[model samples]
Target: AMGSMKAYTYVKPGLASFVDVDKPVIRKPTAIVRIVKTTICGTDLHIIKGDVPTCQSGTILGHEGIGIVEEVGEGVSNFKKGDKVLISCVCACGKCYYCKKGIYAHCEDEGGWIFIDGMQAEYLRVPHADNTLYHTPEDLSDEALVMLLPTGYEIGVLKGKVEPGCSVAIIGSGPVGLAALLTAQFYSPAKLIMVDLDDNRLETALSFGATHKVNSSDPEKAIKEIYDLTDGRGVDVAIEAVGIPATFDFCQKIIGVDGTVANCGVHGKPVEFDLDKLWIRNINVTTGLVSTNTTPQLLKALESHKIEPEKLVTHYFKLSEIEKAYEVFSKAADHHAKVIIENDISEA
Candidate 1:
């Protein structure tokens, strides 16, 4: 059972490619899974760009997927071979102080992200399987609801301090932005404005429940328009859903005197801080890594049709075409939203 398998791996900075690599071995409470569906993450793209130091060359380059359990170490109890499972990008050990605090992002345990292996392969090894894997419903299809699972939709929205009828602005029309858009509607924000540079992206946001769209080609116009919509004040909450200096600055430019700026994007570079301008603004800022604590609750919402995450999918391919998947995902402005890669061969 120990042998090499086809996998997509990080080759070097700004590069990734396919290769044959050793099959993962489970020495602890680890579990080996036959990946059925996987998608490229913004974080994985960061790794490919050499933004993540821990992920060196030869590291497998994925962290999101659904799989069937293939093997488990003696210590695993919640999962068994043949069980269908959902994977979390951030793994946590139930025993750690951070994990106990529901802040799994900072967990300091061997069972968590300290030893991450990529998931863009035919098979994957998950550490601390007991706390890592979630059993999927028997009838659910991976493609039908993969995006519904948690990667911090709640955490990001929570930081925004959304309440019914409050004006809100999100400065990114990416998948994560749409996710915040979708979840934020549950609180019925009075004015939901989505800011982006692309008409296609802004158009898509309208379909996702955004009440208004701002094309940031003219930043001043966008800010003025937002201010006008808020009756000369400003949006109650500004969510920076894009990981770039421009969007971060936009959040600061548009948030009201006592508004909150919730950053949901992943940034590799430092953003400019204007404490002088913000000092008396009484603005609250919040940011954090996703803990995936709402996966189970969201999965229930998915099953009941309270949300349809599949609407975000715009492209698909077999797992063998992972390179092509990246090519399409990297050029998301080409009308692509989400690209799903599936390796669905059944062992039975």
Candidate 2:
């Protein structure tokens, strides 16, 4: 058992309360991170609703964390104490076939990792210390770069696979969706379209770089609007930033012949696919997991000023106010995209 560590645990769906438990100890090459900041995301919503097993009960509740290396165990030479870093959501075994191609999320060694539960806590242990922790750059801060490193920038670069002059439509305007929107600009899409059901998120979407914003509530009209915008054709690339059948449908609806749809969301439920109906259009659908392979590239982009997602940070809370933070995250409607958690806050 860890040494009286306090973790926010979900006793069941719709109930999350703090429980004092043991602070996890380290093994060989293990590094303990004093998590500096974490952000609330849509996925955590799934966990809160008891949809994904990753947020199993009695487990800690955070996945998006930024921190400093507080302690290093034996055989650890790659990292040092006091290093600032971002925690990658998925752990990949470097030797796996998937790892060879940079699909680190599916690496065979992902299971049985160091800390046996969730990430929403004061401290968490990550195995394969060299691979799990990513160093954050000096230029980024809570103000202008938190959302970029952990999510939006990472998902955007991979999901859109935006090429120079490609037509890309990013579905959903949450942090993950918008990150694709912001980074897709690098590929300099000939046209950028953002789709959502809410006006506030759409407002954020427009400010973020959406050339066209559509109220996706009316799917049929939304399709027509996109087709008309593309001169009776459709987008060259459709990014399904939100993992829903509806969003997937939108992605399929917009791609022109030989177009690509990247599904970046981890589906909590099964979504049906109709290939025969859509395959003749020459569509290619791909997906991306947590940015194990993309992190280095993303970090370089952060270092080089290619993209910064700090504007997405509109709300903040202390680690002690985790319950309140989670409430704001799940109930914000479209007014909020991301919320950051910092240990620096004191109890009121």
Tell me how many clashing residue pairs each candidate has: 0, 7
The most accurate candidate by TM-score is 1
What 10-residue stretch in candidate 2 is worst by lDDT? 145-154
Off by over 4 Å in 2: 111-115, 142-159, 334-337, 345-348
Flag clash pairs in model 2: 2-22, 2-23, 3-23, 62-120, 144-310, 145-310, 156-180
lDDT of each: 0.81, 0.72
Cα misplacement distance, residue 276 of candidate 1 (Å):
1.7
Q: Which whole-number lDDT from 0 to 100 does residue 274 have in model 2? A: 72
For candidate 1, write residues 1-348 as lDDT tens digits. 347888888888888888888888887754998888888877777778888877877878788888889999998988999998888777888888889987777778864444356778888888878887898975556775566435436555777889999999988888888888887876888999999998988999999889999999999999999999999989999989888898999999999988999988888689997899999989998887778878787777677766577777779988888888888888888745678898843243
- Per-model TM-score, in order, reads 0.94, 0.90
Q: How far off is residue 253 in model 1, in Å?
A: 1.2
Which TM-score value belongs to model 1?
Answer: 0.94
Candidate 2 C-alpha lDDT tens digits along 1-348: 436666777668877786776676686554777777777767667766778655557877766677778788885677888887777776655667777766666667753222355567777777667777777777767444345333444455555467887778888887778777877876777888888998888988888878889898989999999999889889888878888888887788788988878888877667777787886888788765564566676667666776667776778888788888888878788446478888763111
Q: Model 2 lDDT vs. the true structure?
A: 0.72
